[PDB]
Structures are given as C-alpha cells and as structure tokens.
Write a protein that binds this ligand. Structure first.
Ligand code: HEM
Ligand SMILES: [Mg+2]
Ligand SMILES: [Mg+2]
Ligand SMILES: [Mg+2]
Ligand SMILES: [Mg+2]
Length: 370
C-alpha cells in the first residue's frame, strides 16, 4: 500500500519516511553545525537529561516565562503552577464548546462538493482552547484567528499580538479571578513574582504551541485515512478507533519532526563524543520509525499498541496540551466522518505541506465528496 509520503512527496530529505535507515543513530553534520539524533533510545536519553541537554537555546549564541526555553529549577516551578489548566478535567469542561464549534464549522461546508479541509475545519479550530485558557474575551478571539493565520502563511502580525497580550496581562491584574491568568499574577518563580513580560512570553508560547501542530494533526490523519481505505472503513464503522488512529498519525507523520537541545558539558551518546556548547537536534519523526521500538515501523497501523511515539515528546517538557490535542483531534474527525459519508483527495488539486524542515504536516488539503 502506497504511503502518503510516496503519494505526494512529503519531505524527501526525511529519509525515515521512505523506510531508509540512518547510518548511525547519532550523527554530526558540518553543514548544519549540529548533532542529529535519529534513534528512539538515544532520543529518550537526551530528553531524559535536561541538565546536560539544555532547552535554553540562547546558550549557543525575552525567553523568561517560556517553558520551552526554560530549564529546571525555574521550569519545575512554572510547569507545576500551570499544570492544573491542562488536566483531563479541563479537557472535559471544554469539550462541549469545541464540539459546538466543530458542528458550526462543518455546517458551512455540509452542502459543498469540494472544500479545503484546512481552511474549513483545521485552521479555525485550535485558537478557541488556548483563548479559553488565557481568558481572552470572546470578542477579541477573531484577532487571534487572523494573527495565527498570518504567521502560518509566512514579524508584523506577531508585533500586534504581543502588543495585545501586554495590555491583556495588565488588565488581568485589575480583574482578579481564579483562572490561569490569575494564578500567573499571584505566581512565584525563583522566590519572585512574575512580571508582565513573563506572562506575555508564556501566553505567546501557549498560542504558538497549541495552534499549528494541532492543525497538522487533523490534516495528517485525514491524509492517512485517504491512503489506507480498509483501515478508514473500520474507523467509520467503529469510532472508538479514532484515539488510536490519531496516535499512529503522530507516529507516522510527527507534526514536530524535531526539537532542539544544547549541550552543557562533554557527553557521550551511543559511542559518539559530543562537545560542550553544541546544538543537538532530536528527531521525533526519525525516532518514531525506529524498528528497535516499533514492529514494522514503515507500516501505518491504527491498532497500536500501546503506541509510545514521541509526537508529544518525552521528559520534563512533555506536551502539556497532550490531553487537549487528542480531544480536539477526536472531535474534529468524528464529526467530519458524520457529516461526509465519502471523502477523497483530488489529483488535480494536490495537498500541500509546511516548508519547515523540522516539521511534517499538511498545509492545505482539498477534498471532494464524489
Ligand atoms: C498535535 C499537536 C501538537 C504537537 C505536534 C505538539 C508538540 C509538542 C512537543 C513535541 C512538546 C515537547 C517539546 C520539547 O520537549 O521540547 C510540546 C510541549 C508544549 N506544548 Fe504541545 N503539541 C501539540 C499540541 C499542543 C496543544 C493543544 C497545546 C496547548 C494549547 C500545546 C502547547 C505546548 C506548550 C506551551 C509546551 C511547552 C511545555 C514545556 O516546555 O514544559 N501543544 N508540544
Ligand atoms: Mg534566552
Ligand atoms: Mg536576549
Ligand atoms: Mg488499509
Ligand atoms: Mg480525549
């Protein structure tokens, strides 16, 4: 069966998408001036040692409040403080709103013969969750819909969004409430109250981290359903397969193909000697194709497994929006299949993908009913 990668030429440089093995699981590149980690076990080792493999990228050369760029102990405190807003409890509380939105979005395309799934369902979806968590007024949510689209399209839309979030942080200081913003106002990291800049960077981080990759998740999954008809038929007849389907979609096409790490000391990984102050690229996409961990990794199999892929990552930085992303993917797919009995890709209007080399996901997906 022809994979999505072979059908449309998804990231030809991503050799693992075409069943090709890396010569070594840890390889240095002179052109990139960075170490590449391709193996599953080696990835877990790198991700499991944040003291050696820092997340603070500025070391190799503003980021305060941004969890992605923060190491322990500051990371430990800041994550612990915001953890409550990402639990399965918050997932269940937000589901009816996202369900309603999914219905509304699919009402618009219900009678269409052709439609782009990305612009119809995938793009106008993920903002709502983050907007709810950041207590963005419902009237200002359209602004974030526009801003996030522009940044995806390509500095100017980012400037306006940061400008809004600065005043939003100052407004929430005048309005005390038991939400995520309110807890950030009363928060203490390193024995110090977080300034507006800390909260702005956190808000910016959350918006970026909760948008494009969720969009890629929706796109990639439908792309996989179109490539595997026998498996897609089982999904329509058994909707309880959807959670497993989404997990495999992330293994097969990891929206975040790689994350970045920086060495703090001389370290040996898989016999390779890494020097201090060097960039390390941890390829989630490559690690998800490791046959030492996954049986027949070249095959798409929704029935895995359990499926311990690295699409959400691994370690202390493990995706906080993990539970929220799976839910958003589930609701989007379930209702999409309910509304459209038949969905097909168009050879005349082929799907396009994000150019980013550290990503693997759909940018546009034209669909037809017959
Ligand atoms: C399917 C879509 C998604 C993908 C591909 C994805 C990818 C990731 C990955 C791989 C990490 C770990 C990063 C690392 O180790 O360096 C992560 C953490 C994070 N994610 Fe998820 N994610 C997704 C959904 C979300 C959602 C729904 C949110 C929230 C709205 C979110 C916001 C974050 C934030 C703020 C972090 C940083 C947490 C930390 O550093 O402790 N991402 N995202
Ligand atoms: Mg910095
Ligand atoms: Mg700086
Ligand atoms: Mg099949
Ligand atoms: Mg769920």
């Amino acid at each position: 069966m022809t994979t999505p990668a072979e059908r449309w030429g998804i990231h030809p440089e991503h050799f693992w998408l075409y069943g090709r093995r890396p010569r070594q699981m840890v390889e240095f590149d002179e052109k990139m001036n960075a170490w590449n980690v391709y193996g599953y076990a080696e990835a877990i080792e790198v991700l499991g040692d944040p003291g050696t493999f820092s997340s603070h990228m500025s070391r190799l050369l503003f980021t305060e409040g941004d969890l992605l760029q923060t190491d322990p102990p500051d990371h430990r405190e800041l994550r612990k403080l915001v953890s409550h807003a990402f639990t399965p409890k918050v997932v269940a509380e937000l589901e009816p709103r996202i369900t309603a939105l999914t219905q509304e979005l699919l009402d618009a395309v219900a009678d269409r013969d052709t439609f782009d799934l990305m612009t119809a369902l995938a793009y106008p979806l993920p903002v709502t969750v983050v907007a709810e968590l950041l207590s963005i007024p419902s009237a200002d949510r359209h602004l974030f819909e526009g801003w996030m689209t522009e940044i995806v399209h390509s500095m100017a839309p980012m400037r306006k969004m940061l400008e809004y979030l600065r005043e939003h942080a100052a407004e929430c200081r005048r309005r005390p409430r038991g939400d995520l913003m309110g807890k950030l106002i009363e928060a203490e990291v390193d024995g110090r109250r977080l300034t507006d800049n800390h909260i702005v960077n956190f808000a910016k981080m959350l918006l970026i981290a909760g948008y494009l990759t969720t969009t890629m998740l929706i796109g990639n999954t439908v792309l996989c359903l179109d490539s595997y008809p026998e498996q897609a038929a089982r999904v329509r007849a058994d909707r309880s397969l959807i959670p497993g389907l989404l997990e495999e979609s992330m293994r097969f096409l990891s929206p975040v193909a790689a994350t970045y790490r920086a060495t703090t000391r001389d370290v040996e990984v898989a016999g390779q000697r890494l020097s201090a102050d060097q960039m390390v690229m941890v390829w989630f996409g490559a690690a998800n194709r490791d046959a030492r961990q996954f049986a027949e990794p070249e095959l798409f199999d929704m029935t895995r497994g359990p499926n311990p892929h690295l699409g959400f990552g691994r370690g202390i930085h493990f995706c906080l929006g993990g539970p929220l992303a799976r839910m958003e993917g589930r609701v989007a797919l379930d209702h999409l299949l309910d509304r459209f009995p038949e969905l097909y890709t168009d050879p005349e209007r082929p799907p396009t993908f994000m150019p980013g080399f550290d990503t693997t996901g759909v940018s546009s997906l034209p669909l037809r009913t017959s």
